[PDB]
Amino acid sequence: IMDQVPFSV
Amino acid sequence: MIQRTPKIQVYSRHPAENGKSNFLNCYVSGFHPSDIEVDLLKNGERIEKVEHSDLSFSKDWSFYLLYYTEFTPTEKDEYACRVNHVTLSQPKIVKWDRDM
Amino acid sequence: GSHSMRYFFTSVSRPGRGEPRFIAVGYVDDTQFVRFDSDAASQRMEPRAPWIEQEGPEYWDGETRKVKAHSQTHRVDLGTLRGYYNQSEAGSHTVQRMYGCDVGSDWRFLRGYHQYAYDGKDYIALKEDLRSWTAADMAAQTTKHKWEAAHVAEQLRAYLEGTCVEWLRRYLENGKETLQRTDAPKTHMTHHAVSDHEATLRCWALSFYPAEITLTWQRDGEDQTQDTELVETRPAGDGTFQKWAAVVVPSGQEQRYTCHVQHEGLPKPLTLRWE
Amino acid sequence: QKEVEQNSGPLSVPEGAIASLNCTYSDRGSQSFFWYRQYSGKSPELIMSIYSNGDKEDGRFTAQLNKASQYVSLLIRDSQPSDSATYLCAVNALLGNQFYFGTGTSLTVIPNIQNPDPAVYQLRDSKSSDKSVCLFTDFDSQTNVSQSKDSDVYITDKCVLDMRSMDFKSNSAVAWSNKSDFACANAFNNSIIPEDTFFPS
Amino acid sequence: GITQSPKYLFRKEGQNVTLSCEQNLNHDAMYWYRQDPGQGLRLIYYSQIVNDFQKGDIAEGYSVSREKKESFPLTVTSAQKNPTAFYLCASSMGGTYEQYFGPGTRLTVTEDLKNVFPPEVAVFEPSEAEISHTQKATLVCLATGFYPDHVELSWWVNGKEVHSGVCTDPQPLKEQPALNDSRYALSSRLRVSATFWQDPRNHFRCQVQFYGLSENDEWTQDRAKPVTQIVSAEAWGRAD
């Protein structure tokens, strides 16, 4: 499974 | 921007013997950026229907791809891989050796 | 450690002829099992291993929703980053993100990592404690303070310490005949005449998994690093790997040169000779 | 079943005591766990968030999370009348990239009132002077009221009014009807009367 | 920064409604729920990208369109069998991240507008038997025969709104619970001191705000039109 939707830089 | 030279390796999936069908691999690695043209050549001509793996990178953020096709080697059939990158001024051709 | 789960994401920009291309791949140990490509026709998270195909449609619908949003996040990352260094809209840049967890012999959490790169060099990474950050340049601390105020390391530690190992164990058991296997190397040695006085001995190691392997050359029982050519490990495409190491030898005394192959599927290292 | 379950039944806790709201879920790659507070008629307000096993303290409530056994709890200290609301359980789902809410557990803190003076008074209209209502007030916390079995009689539930001028609260309910023959000693018969009541003339 | 409009909405059965939801947080995802009394939340529609919306659990009769990142307009249609509910709009950064809700919109759809009535508000003075035995006195208020239950009650002592000594029923009761279109009734009580109630200069008023039809809605009946209005009842102190 993949991670949570990432944070934008 | 970091630009790196692709390291080309041409080889067969299994030990090559004449008459038996095998697969011709071209493993480029350690290059940047992503865009790269790879063509498998049979006696100088471009082979259609070559399948490449998915774009993945290593710890140093350099990508590695695997271009393979199904073929059958004979004694006097020359096979080679032609790569083209922004690092190369002209496309580099690496011939396939049955012992490398 | 013993086993590991890893993900790799790349987003290359194409100024003037389309939106940034997004590619995502997933690996367990050295076996790829998922993939995604914005240029591909499926436009969904596709399987690349036999065992992952048994997952339900909610798994694939979810993994597809993530990459569709992860690609959008990298798009605003490319536009924001070209302003951090004041780069033009004509220059083509790329973004690389990766994370994953390593487990021990007990299949419990052993190590976690999460790294981010811009244009091929390090940008920002989660330290081994999974609580701090390592920013590369001045503009790299702009996003660090933005991610420290948002407690990003707290929710990232959970993937690596939590569901990564709990879903890595799920993959190690479902695909047991594929991931928990170990293929010993099939080794042989070739002989090539270079000159009248010298000849190259090439030590082959084929059809081995995982990729980690060590090829050592010895002479009379002593290591010899001089006059040795070692090539990096190559993927065969069969799901296994290939690697060889050579040495140029004066003709007539190849009896003394011994190859040594060390691998996981070999309790004692193999010893290869010409005759 | 649902991805996140919790006892929707109304739970009661005395004022000043500790309220324990429990919540269980189905593991969908669940990683983040939240608690929302929603007062009657308004929107759910995010009040708590935990991400690792253990206890997380903030204010008068703590978030306790166990991931080995699928359950997350919310302990509330010093139960105040402002804590009476339904608390919703939230659990994310990495399998599906979803976010799931529980049905909610209605919490009602009951006041610890002492020296009660149960009685049922009659209040006539200030202007009409021909309408009448009945007031069951100043009864203790154990007493409950029930709905009327007659379509002509209307009964309301308990209600805790707080006079901050003094230092006491008082439960109170109201019963009214259009029968124009009704005496206040006839509606509250359906409910359990503490027998300590005083019915005026 | 999440807003919905309006807080109270009322329409006739057979026409379409458009519940608006604006988002100021620059969150990528937005959600639409409906909340029926005592039955929790249920997802109607949700989106995670600018133009990617996906159907929820109960999308029958609902339509949505996220043309841009800021707004998430949910339009309900006549295909919805039971449109009357509490519609809640939420938004969050990611699909797996915690959501934040707007104020919410209560939509009430009825067969015909004839079932809409403003509340009848009256106050009931305290009894002298309570004043002697308790040294206190309650003022009970009654808002009766109103529909829908879009009512907010408040007490006003000496012209200023008060909250001490005030208790209002959490949600009104159906005067005839067997009927689907039953009227509602709400009660409240303001208990003051006995010495405070006996002061003739003290003014007591029970204020009940009602959210019914708007003046631009059509009304064909000869009865008084149940527009959003204010109904109250006053009371004064009595030394008797």
PDB file of N, CA and C in Angstrom, chain B residues 19 24 27 37 48 52 63 65 91-92:
ATOM      1  N   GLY B  19      20.701 -20.923 -32.513  1.00  0.00           N
ATOM      2  CA  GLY B  19      19.487 -21.606 -32.896  1.00  0.00           C
ATOM      3  C   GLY B  19      18.372 -21.555 -31.870  1.00  0.00           C
ATOM      4  N   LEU B  24      17.354 -10.410 -25.721  1.00  0.00           N
ATOM      5  CA  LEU B  24      18.473  -9.477 -25.771  1.00  0.00           C
ATOM      6  C   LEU B  24      18.154  -8.271 -24.897  1.00  0.00           C
ATOM      7  N   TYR B  27      20.656  -2.734 -20.548  1.00  0.00           N
ATOM      8  CA  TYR B  27      20.431  -2.188 -19.212  1.00  0.00           C
ATOM      9  C   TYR B  27      21.213  -0.886 -19.067  1.00  0.00           C
ATOM     10  N   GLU B  37      16.570   7.806 -25.313  1.00  0.00           N
ATOM     11  CA  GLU B  37      16.147   6.969 -26.428  1.00  0.00           C
ATOM     12  C   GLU B  37      17.037   5.734 -26.483  1.00  0.00           C
ATOM     13  N   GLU B  48      11.747  -3.467 -34.271  1.00  0.00           N
ATOM     14  CA  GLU B  48      10.481  -2.996 -33.735  1.00  0.00           C
ATOM     15  C   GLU B  48      10.067  -3.853 -32.541  1.00  0.00           C
ATOM     16  N   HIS B  52      10.476  -2.066 -22.673  1.00  0.00           N
ATOM     17  CA  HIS B  52      11.326  -1.535 -21.623  1.00  0.00           C
ATOM     18  C   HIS B  52      10.607  -1.601 -20.283  1.00  0.00           C
ATOM     19  N   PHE B  63      18.588   7.084 -12.632  1.00  0.00           N
ATOM     20  CA  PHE B  63      17.604   6.134 -13.128  1.00  0.00           C
ATOM     21  C   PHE B  63      18.276   4.908 -13.741  1.00  0.00           C
ATOM     22  N   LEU B  65      17.005   1.619 -16.521  1.00  0.00           N
ATOM     23  CA  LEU B  65      15.990   1.011 -17.369  1.00  0.00           C
ATOM     24  C   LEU B  65      16.536  -0.269 -17.984  1.00  0.00           C
ATOM     25  N   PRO B  91      24.668   9.531 -30.624  1.00  0.00           N
ATOM     26  CA  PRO B  91      24.276   8.262 -29.999  1.00  0.00           C
ATOM     27  C   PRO B  91      25.436   7.278 -29.940  1.00  0.00           C
ATOM     28  N   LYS B  92      25.579   6.627 -28.787  1.00  0.00           N
ATOM     29  CA  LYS B  92      26.618   5.632 -28.568  1.00  0.00           C
ATOM     30  C   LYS B  92      26.055   4.240 -28.821  1.00  0.00           C
TER      31      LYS B  92
END
